[PDB]
Amino acid sequence: VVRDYFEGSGFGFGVTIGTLCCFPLVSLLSAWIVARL
Amino acid sequence: LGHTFPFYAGPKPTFPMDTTLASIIMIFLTALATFIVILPGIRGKTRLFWLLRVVTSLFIGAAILAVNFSSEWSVGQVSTNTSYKAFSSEWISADIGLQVGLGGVNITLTGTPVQQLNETINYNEEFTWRLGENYAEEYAKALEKGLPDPVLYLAEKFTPRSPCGLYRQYRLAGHYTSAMLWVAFLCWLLANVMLSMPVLVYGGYMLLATGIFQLLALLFFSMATSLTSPCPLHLGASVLHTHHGPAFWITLTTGLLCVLLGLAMAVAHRMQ
Amino acid sequence: LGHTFPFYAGPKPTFPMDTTLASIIMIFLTALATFIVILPGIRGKTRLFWLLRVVTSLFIGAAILAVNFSSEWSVGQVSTNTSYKAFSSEWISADIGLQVGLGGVNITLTGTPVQQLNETINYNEEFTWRLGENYAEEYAKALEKGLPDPVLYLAEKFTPRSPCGLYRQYRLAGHYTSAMLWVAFLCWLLANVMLSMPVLVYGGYMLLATGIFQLLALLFFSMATSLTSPCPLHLGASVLHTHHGPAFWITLTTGLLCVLLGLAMAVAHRMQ
Amino acid sequence: QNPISWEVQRFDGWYNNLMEHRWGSKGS
Amino acid sequence: QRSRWDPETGRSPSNPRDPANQVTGWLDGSAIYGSSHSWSDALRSFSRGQLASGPDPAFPRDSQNPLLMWAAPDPATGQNGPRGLYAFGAERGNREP
Amino acid sequence: SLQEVHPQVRKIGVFSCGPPGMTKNVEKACQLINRQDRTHFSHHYENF
Amino acid sequence: REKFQRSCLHQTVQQFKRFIENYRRHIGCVAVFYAIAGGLFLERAYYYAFAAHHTGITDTTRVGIILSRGTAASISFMFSYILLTMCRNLITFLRETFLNRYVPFDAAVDFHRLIASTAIVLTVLHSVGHVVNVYLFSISPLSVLSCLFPGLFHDDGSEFPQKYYWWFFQTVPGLTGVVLLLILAIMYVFASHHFRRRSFRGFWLTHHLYILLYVLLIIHGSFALIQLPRFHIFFLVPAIIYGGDKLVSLSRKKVEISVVKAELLPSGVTHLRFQRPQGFEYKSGQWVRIA
Ligand SMILES: *[C@@H]1O[C@H](CO)[C@@H](O[C@@H]2O[C@H](CO)[C@@H](O[C@@H]3O[C@H](CO[C@H]4O[C@H](CO[C@H]5O[C@H](CO)[C@@H](O)[C@H](O)[C@@H]5O[C@H]5O[C@H](CO)[C@@H](O)[C@H](O)[C@@H]5O)[C@@H](O)[C@H](O[C@H]5O[C@H](CO)[C@@H](O)[C@H](O)[C@@H]5O)[C@@H]4O)[C@@H](O)[C@H](O[C@H]4O[C@H](CO)[C@@H](O)[C@H](O)[C@@H]4O[C@H]4O[C@H](CO)[C@@H](O)[C@H](O)[C@@H]4O[C@H]4O[C@H](CO)[C@@H](O)[C@H](O)[C@@H]4O)[C@@H]3O)[C@H](O)[C@H]2NC(C)=O)[C@H](O)[C@H]1NC(C)=O
Ligand SMILES: *[C@@H]1O[C@H](CO)[C@@H](O[C@@H]2O[C@H](CO)[C@@H](O[C@@H]3O[C@H](CO[C@H]4O[C@H](CO[C@H]5O[C@H](CO)[C@@H](O)[C@H](O)[C@@H]5O[C@H]5O[C@H](CO)[C@@H](O)[C@H](O)[C@@H]5O)[C@@H](O)[C@H](O[C@H]5O[C@H](CO)[C@@H](O)[C@H](O)[C@@H]5O)[C@@H]4O)[C@@H](O)[C@H](O[C@H]4O[C@H](CO)[C@@H](O)[C@H](O)[C@@H]4O[C@H]4O[C@H](CO)[C@@H](O)[C@H](O)[C@@H]4O[C@H]4O[C@H](CO)[C@@H](O)[C@H](O)[C@@H]4O)[C@@H]3O)[C@H](O)[C@H]2NC(C)=O)[C@H](O)[C@H]1NC(C)=O
Ligand code: HEM
Ligand code: HEM
Ligand SMILES: *[C@@H]1O[C@H](CO)[C@@H](O)[C@H](O)[C@H]1NC(C)=O
Ligand SMILES: *[C@@H]1O[C@H](CO)[C@@H](O)[C@H](O)[C@H]1NC(C)=O
Ligand SMILES: *[C@@H]1O[C@H](CO)[C@@H](O)[C@H](O)[C@H]1NC(C)=O
Ligand SMILES: *[C@@H]1O[C@H](CO)[C@@H](O)[C@H](O)[C@H]1NC(C)=O
Ligand code: NA
């Protein structure tokens, strides 16, 4: 049997990378909300 | 990409030259490039003269630093057939080179061809006698490491206890030559700073002092390395003879240029 | 006087305590003596309060430095009969002490009496796990040196590869406790500087921060050394138990004093 | 052909034993 | 006066002090050619594969550099210096005729 | 012309506060006139 | 009088010569700053590309480790020395000295933005590099990780490495980096010119997060996972200078005054004539600060 270390982690790793890249987007969303208010 | 080991299977690179000399060259070329970019901002006719002044000053500083850190003062090189390693009777045809600097000596063993006895023979070993560093400890560590026989032979030739007194004279010469080269570097810095200031005659005097200190370091190295009893370095069926390397001649040329420029500055000030 | 060798035949002295702690004590006692000499120059009623302020600040700083550099955080000591050296079946009755600090551990082996087996048994060895220092290399050098068996045993108990994970937890605890103690020292310096300035409330806040950082370092050391799996240190027919040493309690008392003084300063400012 | 057909013995006694290179050497 | 000892020894009971041998422990003719390569080079004339000799071919070169030969003063006459001491592989080869 | 209009002056101060190129032009003109030794112009890089 | 030009050659070279002749000081200062940054980056890149073979770090990550470490050195330098651009009292003292002949102190605030404008870019690369590293560390075996990080992993035959989320959220560098990325996102998005036009209080509320950023930068490299933390070495002297400058700014007593007249002068100018404090003595050409 071939042991794969990263099996079952691709989706979560991609989600983590996407959240890291969305940090500026989340900041922009919150800042737009506060600018409107 | 994974699933294989190692992730990078390529041979690891080796830096193609001395890192200290490379760093000096990179820093001074960066300064030169910055000032070349700045050149169009210079006012008028005083651009070619400005360029000459800037390039000359940068060259003087780079020469001081590189020569002080170059292990290329006393150089020699001989092509021979010599025993290579222990537990092996096979001999190698190689160029063995000695490069004695101020703070130590670089022994080079370059195979001819480099690939001999299924091995890569391109050794470039340094043994340093700088203050606070133990040459005997470094030679013992080289013996434990298992360096090739010519390298070990030329290294033990410079041990403090070797019958031929190369170590004492070369350590003294390198130490005081490096001290006076550092003094020359300080004088060059002050020469730049006081050429920035309106008193140009004092800056010319400091440039003259830079040249004088370069000449003094050169003369001290010559005199202290001349007092050596003749150490016969015999490898295979040949004898290696050392001579003043290009660091010595760069010191001479740079010091002569500095003293000439300082004398010209003083005489021009007197005449104008 | 000559004609005999050596010119000085007396036994060479050994410094009677830690050199770092001694230096800290000397520096702060010199500052205290200088300010005591300066005391008559102080104006009027604000001398006893001035004396209390100065002495308290100096004591806080000295406590920070000494505790950060004292190897007296986790202490233990047991009297046993143990094997002493190799190639010798004789045993020694001695007090073996463990003194784990932030940057390493001091293992003490004091004979009872000190003169046993025609030897002086007063060993006080340090093994450091500070950043950049290799604990395994130090233990290997101790093995090559030939340290007595209890010292080697307690030293290998803290090796990175020892089955009981003392090394990892103690290194982490000491590293971050030392970092936060340095932060507390910086806050103490700023507290002095801003108590010199007219804004006393900010200086009181900085003193409060010094106390908070001392408490944080104490708590981190406790938590990180508590997560250890129980390492049974068995020497001879006894087991050595470690406990929070006087460095821990000095940290606690000094941090409580600093936080109390900061709270008092803030409340007095609010009430006046 | 090289007249020196063997491995010349070192003067300092190093590399005489295969695995203990300091054996019999000067300063040991 | 105490002799040279191994710097890695003589500090703790499990590793007591051990003397250091100043010549090669091998029976390798080091008393003839020296215990180091530089010593052997100092002892050679580099001509016809012969050990260096003085004006008389039956005697090696007189010692000149102080690093070469042990030069204990003559107990009888007090004569010192390397003026009459021959150069051998063994540093103390001139202890007696 | 400033030298001509004030013939009895000997030291004239000029102070330039502006972009580096224009101030450099002022200094270069000052040096060019000072090459003639009739009167002295002293120039300052003023940066209020 | 005047002269027009040919657009292709003469006008463009005239504009370029004018730009150099004006902003020669800016060229020199930007060149030396970016030269220091590039020198640190190249030092770390050389160490990890030529002088780190004994560790085997490049047998698993070569591009990632070089990018991360070089950008880490550059980031440490930039975040340490960005405080020097805000030493208002030191800038004021050097604003008139002969150093102004070479250093355009007037553009300090602008330089501030420029430094930040560079830093975040490199910061992203830093994070990006470590992301790559993490993935490789998530597929390397336990033995390789034990060789790379002896003080963090021990090869016991389990043969299975840690997960990606262990690196990202169960390690001091990972947690500190994630929180630092969040802080940078907030600070840079809010402090942008667009939102600084939008609002003023939020700008400072988010821009004062630099103290938390520096605390998390001190903590970030503290674990000494890859190398010993050098950020405090870079941060020490600029922090001391900035603290002294801020303390001096606090020391000065800011007078409170009222305006007498306000004029909306053409070309979008405001003429503010306000009451002089009693002991206000000044010479011509001197400048003040207002809030
Ligand atoms: C004056 O002299 C100065 C001193 O030389 C000089 O300054 C020096 O400048 C040079 C740059 O010009 C620099 O030094 C070089 O650095 C290179 C890179 O250094 C890194 O990599 C090495 C390599 O380590 C790998 O291999 C060893 C075994 O050899 C393993 O133990 C390692 O784990 C590692 O193995 C991995 O990588 C391999 C890559 O293929 C894989 O195959 C393997 O499976 C593994 O994956 C490391 O050792 C270095 O670490 C060392 O140093 C650091 C810091 O000092 C220490 O912390 C650490 O503990 C180590 O001690 C570093 O990480 C070096 O490769 C290079 O070394 C060669 O040259 C020197 C000098 O001659 C030799 O001593 C050395 O043995 C190497 O020579 C062999 O290899 C070359 C080609 O590789 C051959 O041409 C040569 O003939 C010789 O071959 C012989 O041995 C081979 C096996 O080793 C064998 O295959 C052959 O067949 C043959 O038998 C060199 O050191 C550096 O800047 C300076 N050096 C310093 C500061 O020490 C200065 O410029 C001079 N001045 C002037 C004016 O000229
Ligand atoms: C946490 O731990 C920290 C680490 O300990 C601690 O910091 C330390 O503080 C202490 C001060 O409190 C300091 O360390 C001490 O320093 C003393 C002085 O150091 C100088 O002298 C020694 C002695 O060297 C002589 O002897 C050796 C052989 O032993 C020879 O090789 C030498 O050539 C020299 O010999 C001449 O002098 C003799 C004097 O009588 C003559 O008899 C002889 O004929 C010669 O004329 C030197 O070795 C030192 O140099 C070393 O260090 C420097 C710098 O690091 C290096 O450059 C150098 O290369 C050397 O490595 C230095 O010059 C030391 O004497 C003292 O050492 C004793 O204690 C340590 C620790 O336990 C032992 O490891 C060591 O072996 C000694 O223990 C023996 O001796 C004492 C009494 O002498 C006995 O009580 C003890 O039981 C033990 O006896 C055993 O061995 C004896 C033979 O050695 C034997 O006779 C006995 O019978 C028995 O078998 C100690 O190191 C220093 O400030 C710190 N140490 C550091 C930094 O390393 C810190 O405070 C702790 N923290 C807290 C909170 O407590
Ligand atoms: C991590 C990145 C940054 C750090 C650490 C930083 C640091 C600082 C500091 C210390 C101050 C002075 C605060 C004070 O004196 O009270 C300041 C002010 C300021 N910053 Fe930043 N800054 C960063 C990024 C930025 C960016 C991206 C911008 C704009 C796009 C910006 C624009 C400003 C402005 C306009 C001021 C006010 C200038 C003044 O009032 O003199 N900064 N910053
Ligand atoms: C997911 C995001 C990040 C990850 C995974 C990460 C990871 C790392 C790691 C593993 C180190 C080595 C530290 C050590 O060996 O102890 C490091 C160092 C460093 N990182 Fe990050 N980082 C991230 C984001 C950031 C951010 C946002 C910044 C700056 C705002 C930054 C700046 C630095 C600096 C300056 C160092 C060197 C610190 C020192 O040398 O003391 N990194 N990073
Ligand atoms: C080395 O050996 C080769 C072949 O044996 C010979 O051609 C060459 O001349 C030799 N070189 C020296 C310097 O003896
Ligand atoms: C050694 O060198 C020879 C000739 O250069 C070559 O044929 C051979 O493949 C090399 N390797 C080995 C293991 O012999
Ligand atoms: C050590 O041995 C002595 C005598 O043999 C004995 O009196 C003492 O109780 C022993 N101590 C321990 C801790 O075993
Ligand atoms: C050793 O100790 C015993 C008793 O303490 C003492 O009588 C003797 O003189 C000491 N020295 C030697 C060499 O035995
Ligand atoms: Na022998």
Q: Determine if ligand 2 sits within 6 Å of the CB of residue C122.
A: yes
Q: What is the DSSP pairing of strand C104-116 with strand C91-100?
A: antiparallel
Nearest to G243 by CA among G105, G15, G83: G83
Find out whether B83 and D8 touch, Cβ atoms under 8 Å: yes
What distances in angstroms separate CA B41 from CA B36, B187, B195, G16, one per listed residue? Answer: 10, 29, 20, 10
- Ligand 1 neighbours, Cβ below 6 Å, are B 11-12, 14-15, 17-19, 70-72, 106, 119-126; G 50-54, 56, 59
Nearest to D18 among B87, B91, B143 (CB): B87
Task: State which residue of chain B sits closest to G18, comparing Cα positions.
Answer: B41
Taking residue E75's Cβ as centre, other Cβ atoms within 10 Å add up to 7
CA distance B34 to B27: 11
Q: D19: which chain B residues are within 8 Å (Cβ-Cβ)?
A: none
Q: What is the DSSP pairing of strand B91-100 with strand B104-116?
A: antiparallel
Exposure string of B115-131, with b = 16+ CB inside 10 Å and e = fewer, is: ebeeeebebebebbbee
Q: B7: which chain G residues are within 8 Å (Cβ-Cβ)?
A: 59-62, 136, 140
Report residue B29 as tokens.
């070329």
Q: After which residues is chain G broken (C to N over 2.5 A)?
A: none
Find out whether C217 and C251 touch, Cβ atoms under 8 Å: yes
Taking residue G89's Cβ as centre, other Cβ atoms within 10 Å add up to 16
D16 touches chain E (CB under 8 A): yes
Residue the block writes with tokens 């057939």: B81
Query: Strand, coil or helix: what is E8?
Result: coil
Phi, psi of B229 (to 5 degrees): -65, 145
Q: At what angle do helices A10-36 and G172-190 cross, to 10 degrees?
A: 30
H helices, E strands: number in chain C: 7, 7
Contact C197 G251 (CB under 8 A): yes
Beta-carbon pairs below 8 A across chains B and G: 53
C74 Cα to the center of ligand 3, angstroms: 45
F15 touches chain G (CB under 8 A): no
Separation in Å, CA of E6 to nearest CA in chain C: 12
Nearest to B89 by CA among D1, E24, E29: D1
Q: G285: which chain F residues are within 8 Å (Cβ-Cβ)?
A: 46, 48
Task: State which residue of chain B sits closest to G35, comparing Cα positions.
Answer: B30
Q: Determine if ligand 2 sits within 6 Å of the CB of residue C125.
A: yes
CA distance B209 to B255: 10
Query: Strand, coil or helix: what is G24?
Result: helix
CA distance B71 to E39: 26
Q: F28: which chain B residues are within 8 Å (Cβ-Cβ)?
A: 43-44
Nearest to B12 by CA among G59, C89, C68, A22: G59
Positive or negative: CA dihedral G185, G187, G190, G191: negative
Query: Strand, coil or helix: what is B100?
Result: strand
Q: Determine if ligand 2 sits within 6 Å of the CB of residue C117.
A: no
> For residue B95, what is the enclosing H or E element?
strand B91-100
> For residue A20, what is the enclosing H or E element?
helix A10-36
Report residue E55 as tokens.
């004006």
Instruction: List, as one string, the DSSP characters of G57-96.
Output: GGGT-SHHHHHHHHHHHHHHHHHHHTGGGG-HHHHHHHTS
Contact G18 F48 (CB under 8 A): no
CA nearest ligand 3 atom 11, residue:
G86
Beta bridge partners of G274: G259
Contact B156 E42 (CB under 8 A): no
CA distance B38 to F16: 22
* Positions of E strands within E1-97: none
| Resolution of the experimental model, in Å, one decimal | 2.8
Separation in Å, CA of B170 to nearest CA in chain D: 24
What distances in angstroms separate CA E60 from CA B157, B177, E43, E50, E87, one per listed residue? Answer: 21, 38, 8, 10, 6
C139 touches chain E (CB under 8 A): no
Q: Do the chains B and E touch each other, judged by at least 3 C-beta pairs below 8 angstroms?
A: yes
Residue type, G251: S
What letter does residue E87 receive in the DSSP assignment?
P
Contact G141 B5 (CB under 8 A): yes
Q: Determine if ligand 2 sits within 6 Å of the CB of residue C19.
A: yes
Q: What is the largest distance, in Å, between two alpha-carbon atoms of chain A?
A: 59
Query: Strand, coil or helix: what is G273?
Result: strand
Which experimental approach was used here? Answer: cryo-EM
Positive or negative: CA dihedral C170, C172, C175, C176: negative
C239 Cα to the center of ligand 7, angstroms: 14
What distances in angstroms separate CA G265 from CA B228, G48, G261, G270, one per listed residue? Answer: 86, 60, 12, 6
What distances in angstroms separate CA B107 from CA B21, B68, B122, B124, D10, one per listed residue? Answer: 17, 18, 11, 6, 20
CA distance B57 to B51: 10
B109 Cα to the center of ligand 1, angstroms: 14
B204: Cα within 13 Å, side-chain hemisphere: 15
* Positions of E strands within chain C: 74-83, 91-100, 104-116, 119-128, 233-235, 238-240, 243-244
Q: Which ligand is nearest to the CA of B113?
A: 6
What letter does residue C148 receive in the DSSP assignment?
-
Q: Give the angle subtended at the CA of G185 by the CAs of G184 and G187, to the nearest 5°.
A: 60
Residue the block writes with tokens 């009496």: C113
Report residue C88 as tokens.
């010798």
CA distance G145 to G171: 14
Report residue C101 as tokens.
């600090």
What letter does residue G7 receive in the DSSP assignment?
I
Nearest to B57 by CA among B268, B264, B257, B265: B257
Distance of CA B253 to the CA centre of its chain: 15
Find out whether B213 and B38 touch, Cβ atoms under 8 Å: no
CA nearest ligand 4 atom 22, residue:
G177
Q: Do the chains F and A touch each other, judged by at least 3 C-beta pairs below 8 angstroms?
A: no
Beta bridge partners of B91: B83
Find out whether C144 and G127 touch, Cβ atoms under 8 Å: no
CA distance C247 to C253: 10
E10: Cα within 13 Å, side-chain hemisphere: 9
Nearest to G99 by CA among C204, B196, B42, C50: B196
Contacts of E69 (CB under 8 A, 6+ apart): E63, E82, E85, E86, E87, E88, E91, E93, E94
Q: Determine if ligand 7 sits within 6 Å of the CB of residue C237.
A: yes
CA distance C217 to C196: 27
Phi, psi of B125 (to 5 degrees): -105, 145
Contact F21 G21 (CB under 8 A): yes
Residue type, E71: A
B92 Cα to the center of ligand 6, angstroms: 15
Nearest to B231 by CA among B76, B28, B94: B76
Nearest to C171 by CA among C108, C221, C214, C99: C221
Residues written for chain C: 272
Q: Which ligand is nearest to the CA of G72?
A: 4
Contacts of G216 (CB under 8 A, 6+ apart): G176, G179, G180, G183
Find out whether G165 and G137 touch, Cβ atoms under 8 Å: no
B245: Cα within 13 Å, side-chain hemisphere: 21
Contacts of C195 (CB under 8 A, 6+ apart): C53, C57, C203, C204, C207
Contact B239 E46 (CB under 8 A): yes
Separation in Å, CA of C169 to nearest CA in chain E: 30
Contact C145 E13 (CB under 8 A): no
G49 touches chain B (CB under 8 A): yes
CA distance B82 to B107: 15
Give the ligand 1 atom nearest the CA of B6: 46
Query: Strand, coil or helix: what is C184?
Result: helix
CA nearest ligand 4 atom 34, residue:
G72
Find out whether C63 and C92 touch, Cβ atoms under 8 Å: no
Find out whether E60 and E51 touch, Cβ atoms under 8 Å: yes
Nearest to B169 by CA among B215, B97, B223: B223
B241 Cα to the center of ligand 5, angstroms: 19
The chains in contact with chain C, meaning 3 or more Cβ pairs closer than 8 Å, are E, G
Nearest to E19 by CA among E7, E5, E2: E5
Find out whether B180 and B220 touch, Cβ atoms under 8 Å: yes
Q: Give the angle subtended at the CA of B241 by the CAs of B223 and B141, to the nearest 5°.
A: 90
CA distance C181 to C192: 17
Please report, to the nearest 10 degrees, the dihedral formed by the alpha carbons of residues B112, B113, B118, B119 taken in order. 60
Q: At what angle do helices G24-50 and G12-22 cross, to 10 degrees?
A: 80
Q: Which ligand is nearest to the CA of B240?
A: 5
Give the ligand 4 atom nearest the CA of G232: 41
Nearest to F47 among G21, G96, G286 (CB): G96
Q: Exposed, middle or buried: residue C139 (CB in 10 Å: 0-12, 13-18, 19+)?
A: buried
Contact D21 B144 (CB under 8 A): yes
CA distance G77 to G115: 10
For a mutational test of ligand 2's pocket, the pick from C70, C124, C138, i.e. the residue with the most ligand atoms closer than 8 A to its C-beta, is C124
What distances in angstroms separate CA B229 from CA B37, B166, B232, C138, E83, one per listed residue? Answer: 53, 8, 9, 44, 17
Sheet strand arrangement including B119-128: B119-128, B104-116, B91-100, B74-83, B243-244
Exposure string of B9-37, with b = 16+ CB inside 10 Å and e = fewer, is: eeeeeeeeebeebebbeebbebbeebbee
Contacts of E64 (CB under 8 A, 6+ apart): B229, E82
Residues written for chain D: 28
For a mutational test of ligand 4's pocket, the pick from G188, G213, G220, G232, i.e. the residue with the most ligand atoms closer than 8 A to its C-beta, is G220
Secondary structure string (H, E, C) spanning B31-67:
HHHHHHHHHHHCCCCCCHHHHHHHHHHHHHHHHHHHH
Contacts of D23 (CB under 8 A, 6+ apart): D13, D16, D17, E25
Q: Which ranges of B121-165 would DSSP assign to H, the alpha helix?
A: 135-145, 149-156
Find out whether B177 and B167 touch, Cβ atoms under 8 Å: no
Q: What is the largest distance, in Å, between two alpha-carbon atoms of chain G?
A: 87
Beta bridge partners of F16: F45
Contact E15 C144 (CB under 8 A): yes
